[PDB]
Design a protein around this ligand. Structure first.
Ligand SMILES: [Ca+2]
Ligand SMILES: [Ca+2]
Lengths: 65, 172
């Protein structure tokens, strides 16, 4: 499921910590869960979209456009 | 393990600004690498103008974490029209000495009491989970405030006890 980087069935700040690490390396174990805009990379867009979901302002993942 | 979070009380006239301190107590010795909570309120009485980082979250993580420039360590989203503000602090740094590790002021809220607010009126300043789904399409909301850390990419999640604050307007 999208946003769940440790894979425990919740999307929370602990996945955001993993999202931060994923951006440094451009890779993580659950790549598809981390690539929120589906453009083949993990970068600041994904990090932002994850943060926006946690803030409650972005209602859906994955992201369109 | 467990940690306490609380909001102070304030008094201010209609149209004046007020401050509320958000504090942590009984921070475990293992520390807090990530924390996420919402501040909820009645927007007909108060609105939040800013939220500033507190002493205990003012660590080296903000200036040394690589992704800090892409997404700030202390990350705030004020949603006055929705009646809440969301506060997230997180870091990818592994060194626990850069995490939140002491009791004290986590952040300071500055807000404004409505010009219309009549004498005696009140509004709770509640600390609770951001209203969002546990995962996308779950149909069930996030029910607890998040606070903890990761070790071996595995989340260690503390229980969080919340004490709410209050804003009241005097008489003249
Ligand atoms: Ca998760
Ligand atoms: Ca991407």
């Amino acid at each position: 499921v999208y946003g769940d980087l440790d894979g425990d069935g919740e999307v929370d700040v602990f996945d955001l910590i993993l999202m931060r690490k994923a951006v440094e390396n451009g890779d993580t174990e659950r790549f598809e869960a981390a690539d929120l805009n589906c453009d083949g990379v993990i970068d600041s867009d994904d990090l932002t979209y994850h943060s926006e979901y946690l803030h409650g302002i972005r209602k859906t993942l994955p992201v369109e456009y | 393990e467990t940690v306490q979070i609380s909001a102070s009380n304030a008094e201010a006239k209609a149209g004046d600004q007020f401050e509320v301190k958000v504090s942590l107590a009984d921070v475990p010795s293992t520390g807090i690498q990530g924390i996420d909570f919402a501040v909820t309120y009645d927007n007909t009485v108060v609105t939040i103008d800013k939220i500033t980082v507190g002493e205990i979250a003012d660590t080296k993580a903000a200036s040394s974490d690589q992704t800090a420039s892409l997404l700030p360590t202390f990350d705030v989203s004020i949603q006055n029209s929705e009646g809440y503000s969301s506060v997230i602090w997180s870091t990818a740094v592994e060194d626990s000495s850069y995490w939140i590790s002491k009791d004290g002021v986590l952040c300071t809220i500055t807000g404004t009491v409505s010009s219309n607010a009549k004498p005696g009126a009140e509004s709770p300043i509640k600390l609770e989970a951001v209203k969002r789904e546990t995962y996308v399409g779950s149909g069930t909301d996030n029910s607890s405030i998040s606070a903890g850390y990761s070790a071996n990419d595995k989340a260690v999640k503390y229980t969080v006890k919340a004490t709410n604050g209050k804003i009241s307007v005097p008489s003249a």
